[PDB]
Amino acid sequence: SWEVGCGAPVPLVKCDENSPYRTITGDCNNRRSPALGAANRALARWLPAEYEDGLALPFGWTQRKTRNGFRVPLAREVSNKIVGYLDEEGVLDQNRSLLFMQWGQIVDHDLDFAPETELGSNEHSKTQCEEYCIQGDNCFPIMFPKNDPKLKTQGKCMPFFRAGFVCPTPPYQSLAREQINAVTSFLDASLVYGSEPSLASRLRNLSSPLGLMAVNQEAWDHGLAYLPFNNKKPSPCEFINTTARVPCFLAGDFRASEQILLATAHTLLLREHNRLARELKKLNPHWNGEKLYQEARKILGAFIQIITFRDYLPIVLGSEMQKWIPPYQGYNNSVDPRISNVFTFAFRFGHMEVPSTVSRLDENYQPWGPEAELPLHTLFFNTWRIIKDGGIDPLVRGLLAKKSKLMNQDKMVTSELRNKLFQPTHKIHGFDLAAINLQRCRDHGMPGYNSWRGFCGLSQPKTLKGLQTVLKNKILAKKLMDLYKTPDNIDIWIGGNAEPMVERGRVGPLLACLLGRQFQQIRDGDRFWWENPGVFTEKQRDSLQKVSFSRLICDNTHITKVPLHAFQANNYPHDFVDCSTVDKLDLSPWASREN
Ligand code: HEM
Ligand SMILES: *[C@@H]1O[C@H](CO)[C@@H](O[C@@H]2O[C@H](CO)[C@@H](O[C@H]3O[C@H](CO)[C@@H](O)[C@H](O)[C@@H]3O)[C@H](O)[C@H]2NC(C)=O)[C@H](O)[C@H]1NC(C)=O
Numbered sequence: 001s002w003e004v005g006c007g008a009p010v011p012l013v014k015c016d017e018n019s020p021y022r023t024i025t026g027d028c029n030n031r032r033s034p035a036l037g038a039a040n041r042a043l044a045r046w047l048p049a050e051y052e053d054g055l056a057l058p059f060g061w062t063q064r065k066t067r068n069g070f071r072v073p074l075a076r077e078v079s080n081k082i083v084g085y086l087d088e089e090g091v092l093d094q095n096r097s098l099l100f101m102q103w104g105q106i107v108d109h110d111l112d113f114a115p116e117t118e119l120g121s122n123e124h125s126k127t128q129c130e131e132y133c134i135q136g137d138n139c140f141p142i143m144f145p146k147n148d149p150k151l152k153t154q155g156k157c158m159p160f161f162r163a164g165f166v167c168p169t170p171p172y173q174s175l176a177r178e179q180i181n182a183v184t185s186f187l188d189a190s191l192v193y194g195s196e197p198s199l200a201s202r203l204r205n206l207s208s209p210l211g212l213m214a215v216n217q218e219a220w221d222h223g224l225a226y227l228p229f230n231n232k233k234p235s236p237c238e239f240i241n242t243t244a245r246v247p248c249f250l251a252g253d254f255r256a257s258e259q260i261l262l263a264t265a266h267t268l269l270l271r272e273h274n275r276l277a278r279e280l281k282k283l284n285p286h287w288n289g290e291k292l293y294q295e296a297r298k299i300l301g302a303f304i305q306i307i308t309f310r311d312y313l314p315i316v317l318g319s320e321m322q323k324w325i326p327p328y329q330g331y332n333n334s335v336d337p338r339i340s341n342v343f344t345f346a347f348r349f350g351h352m353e354v355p356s357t358v359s360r361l362d363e364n365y366q367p368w369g370p371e372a373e374l375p376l377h378t379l380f381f382n383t384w385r386i387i388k389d390g391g392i393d394p395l396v397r398g399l400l401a402k403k404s405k406l407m408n409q410d411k412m413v414t415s416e417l418r419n420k421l422f423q424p425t426h427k428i429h430g431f432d433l434a435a436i437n438l439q440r441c442r443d444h445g446m447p448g449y450n451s452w453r454g455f456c457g458l459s460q461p462k463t464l465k466g467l468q469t470v471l472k473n474k475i476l477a478k479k480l481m482d483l484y485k486t487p488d489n490i491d492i493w494i495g496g497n498a499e500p501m502v503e504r505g506r507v508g509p510l511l512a513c514l515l516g517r518q519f520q521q522i523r524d525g526d527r528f529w530w531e532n533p534g535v536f537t538e539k540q541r542d543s544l545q546k547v548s549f550s551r552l553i554c555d556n557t558h559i560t561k562v563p564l565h566a567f568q569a570n571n572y573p574h575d576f577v578d579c580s581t582v583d584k585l586d587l588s589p590w591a592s593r594e595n
């Protein structure tokens with residue numbers, strides 16, 4: 001019946017059980033089941049996997065074997081016929097700041113990460129793949145359909161490598177393939193501190209006994225810190241401008257430099273740690289480094305949970321928030337905290353919220369310079385624009401003043417991402433994130449669209465007319481049917497995002513259900529949830545419900561004007577107020593006394 005074990009990629013050491021602090025690997029959160037929610041374990045399955053050979057081969061791998069009677073349409077073709085659009089006019093969200101999109105990518109990276117398989121570097125299969133598009137082993141190419149412009153310009157495919165799985169990393173067979181989640185499942189700010197002890201330690205400043213995080217020594221942002229540079233050459237960040245040779249940043253998560261605005265947010269969090277750390281030393285001079293580090297790390301973890309659950313989720317889920325996430329009632333040690341495989345695709349809805357340009361604003365929110373509005377694709381793994389071109393402040397003003405892209409059925413994913421995505425392994429700005437998502441969907445063996453509608457207790461359309469009704473769109477339904485032949489075959493990623501948004505939210509009914517369950521589970525199944533009695537004191541808690549992203553900005557940048565509600569669309573200068581008007585985090589409740 002049960003396959004209750006395999007376990008090598010699985011970090012391992014004892015629990016303190018009385019320690020008031022989370023471990024780095026997530027281990028020991030649950031006392032009865034210690035590895036529950038830990039990093040480097042398999043992603044949870046809410047539904048049985050669906051592979052072509054029922055074991056590990058993804059659908060579309062063998063070109064003669066169908067899925068429910070039909071061939072699965074090429075990922076790229078679905079991308080071309082349904083996901084793309086040309087006109088960026090009128091695509092912006094009239095009531096969601098650019099920060100709304102950016103916070104999601106943060107939360108996301110704190111929750112899941114399914115890295116690609118290795119099988120060595122000095123490899124020539126990493127070459128056999130992008131070079132000859134030969135499917136086999138972990139190379140699973142995204143072929144181009146006929147009439148694709150990339151055929152004339154890029155080759156016959158886009159290389160793609162399968163995601164890592166448990167038990168090993170190499171040639172495996174037995175049980176059904178299960179992907180790895182290299183990060184901790186709890187909302188614990190592991191994207192700032194790391195998910196491995198090795199990496200957690202390297203990020204720390206273990207010279208001064210101040211419990212500070214290591215900062216860049218080669219550059220400063222007007223007296224403020226930058227994350228240290230990465231050790232690793234060759235570096236993607238310097239590849240995109242060999243004259244500036246500015247390496248990628250080093251952080252608790254390896255995706256930190258994936259795009260300038262994500263690197264900006266990471267910098268804000270690293271700065272807040274140090275601020276909290278030296279601010280604490282000022283109240284408790286006897287406390288040592290470890291103590292300063294852990295007590296800071298704890299506040300920051302609580303901070304991320306509060307903004308997320310109090311300001312972020314209510315405006316994603318909308319009126320469905322209360323339906324899936326009822327008021328907190330206490331830690332439930334029986335709740336499965338782990339991130340499911342499907343969540344890592346459902347949370348990718350944020351990809352349709354990314355706009356095609358990033359702006360830099362000057363002190364009183366005017367265009368910063370002449371090349372102030374930049375195309376998104378010039379910013380992937382671009383760190384030199386931060387170091388050499390103004391610091392983070394100008395980028396932060398743009399997060400508050402500019403808007404997120406609104407999901408639109410006739411305009412899903414901007415071309416900056418759909419045709420010009422830059423991958424760290426490769427050299428070109430010619431990848432397609434939408435095609436990647438779909439090929440990945442299949443790589444993870446995801447059940448079709450209708451299996452998930454059933455799971456969420458929602459109708460399952462079997463016909464065209466039925467699909468029109470659910471999507472409330474005749475044209476979109478048609479295209480989907482033409483490519484998939486049956487709703488049963490629609491990949492969850494596009495199926496889920498193709499649904500119209502629920503009242504006051506930004507995701508449809510299927511997504512709201514998937515997102516909702518997961519968040520309820522990681523709150524309820526987290527022994528260290530900030531509201532769990534005994535984790536913080538009542539006074540420490542009254543002091544924490546006063547935090548805000550605005551304040552975080554005021555305390556860690558030289559910006560002096562900020563909106564009160566950073567997540568909603570704000571117009572300068574009316575909606576903006578002076579920093580000294582916003583509530584500070586009162587740390588006195590963290591002071592101690594001797595005898
Ligand atoms: C400029 C903005 C962004 C870029 C360039 C970007 C890029 C990427 C790339 C390259 C992947 C890996 C795909 C794969 O190989 O399977 C990925 C994964 C993902 N992204 Fe994004 N992303 C962006 C924004 C966002 C946002 C705003 C959200 C949510 C609000 C989000 C959620 C996710 C999730 C859930 C994954 C899968 C992670 C895993 O392995 O567990 N992303 N992104
Ligand atoms: C732009 O987006 C905003 C959110 O979608 C929207 O306002 C939000 O509506 C909620 C409705 O519940 C309100 O939130 C709080 O309202 C009162 C305060 O007066 C509280 O006592 C309640 O507990 C509730 O949480 C706010 O009015 C607002 N939400 C937040 C967090 O501020 C705006 O109206 C939207 N603008 C337009 C033009 O649609």
Ligand SMILES: *[C@@H]1O[C@H](CO)[C@@H](O[C@@H]2O[C@H](CO)[C@@H](O[C@H]3O[C@H](CO)[C@@H](O)[C@H](O)[C@@H]3O)[C@H](O)[C@H]2NC(C)=O)[C@H](O)[C@H]1NC(C)=O
Pocket residue numbers: 240241243244384388
């Ligand atoms: C690669 O990075 C280069 C620097 O990291 C960058 O060049 C820099 O940006 C512009 C050049 O276009 C110059 O900015 C302005 O500087 C002053 C004005 O304040 C004047 O000298 C000029 O008017 C100039 O426009 C920087 O001086 C320049 N720095 C260097 C060393 O060239 C490149 O644009 C980047 N190249 C690519 C392909 O990304």
Ligand SMILES: *[C@@H]1O[C@H](CO)[C@@H](O[C@@H]2O[C@H](CO)[C@@H](O)[C@H](O)[C@H]2NC(C)=O)[C@H](O)[C@H]1NC(C)=O
Pocket residue numbers: 205207208212213214215216217
């Ligand atoms: C570790 O922390 C120490 C203490 O702040 C840092 O040293 C200070 O850094 C700058 C010099 O670059 C100046 O403020 C002083 O010279 C130093 N002060 C003291 C008291 O030594 C050090 O830079 C940090 N190291 C890392 C890698 O982040």
Ligand SMILES: *[C@@H]1O[C@H](CO)[C@@H](O[C@@H]2O[C@H](CO)[C@@H](O)[C@H](O)[C@H]2NC(C)=O)[C@H](O)[C@H]1NC(C)=O
Pocket residue numbers: 332334335336
């Ligand atoms: C703790 O959460 C678990 C789910 O992880 C809940 O378990 C339910 O237990 C009831 C009986 O009390 C059964 O009817 C169901 O089989 C369980 N439901 C689910 C969704 O698994 C339980 O309700 C919670 N326990 C407490 C005390 O709140």
Ligand SMILES: [Ca+2]
Pocket residue numbers: 110111183184185186187188189190191
């Ligand atoms: Ca985490």
Ligand SMILES: [Cl-]
Pocket residue numbers: 044045046047340341342343
């Ligand atoms: Cl799943």
Ligand SMILES: [Cl-]
Pocket residue numbers: 077080081145146147148
């Ligand atoms: Cl096509």
Ligand SMILES: [Cl-]
Pocket residue numbers: 223224225271274
């Ligand atoms: Cl700083």
Ligand SMILES: [Cl-]
Pocket residue numbers: 215216217218228229
């Ligand atoms: Cl450095």
Ligand SMILES: [Cl-]
Pocket residue numbers: 255258
């Ligand atoms: Cl990424």
Ligand SMILES: [Cl-]
Pocket residue numbers: 305306309310
């Ligand atoms: Cl909360």
Ligand SMILES: [Cl-]
Pocket residue numbers: 377378429
């Ligand atoms: Cl370019």
Ligand SMILES: [Cl-]
Pocket residue numbers: 460461462463465466467
């Ligand atoms: Cl029907």
Ligand SMILES: [Cl-]
Pocket residue numbers: 095504505
């Ligand atoms: Cl709204």
Ligand SMILES: [Cl-]
Pocket residue numbers: 362363364365558559560561
């Ligand atoms: Cl300002």
Ligand SMILES: [Cl-]
Pocket residue numbers: 311565566567568
């Ligand atoms: Cl807000």
